[PDB]
Design a protein around this ligand. Structure first.
Ligand SMILES: [Ga+3]
Ligand SMILES: [Ga+3]
Lengths: 36, 36
C-alpha cells in the first residue's frame, strides 16, 4: 500500500496509516484490510 | 495493537501507524508485523 493511505479492519475496527510503502497486502483478523 | 504504536513488515519494508486500536494481529507478506 501507499504512503498516507488509511486502512481499516472491518472485523475488529483496527485502523492503520501507511508511513512507508511496501508491496505486501495488509491483513487483520485473517482478512485483507479495507482502504478508506 | 495500541494506538500510536508503529508496526513493520520485515520482509517488504512496509511501515504503518495504528490510529485506532483493535485486537487483531497485523499481517503483511504472510507474516506477523513487528512492533517498533
Ligand atoms: Ga510485507
Ligand atoms: Ga482486525
Amino acid at each position: 500500500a501507499n504512503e498516507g493511505d488509511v486502512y481499516k479492519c472491518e472485523l475488529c475496527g483496527q485502523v492503520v496509516k501507511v508511513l512507508e510503502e511496501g508491496g505486501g497486502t495488509l491483513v487483520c483478523c485473517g482478512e485483507d484490510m479495507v482502504k478508506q
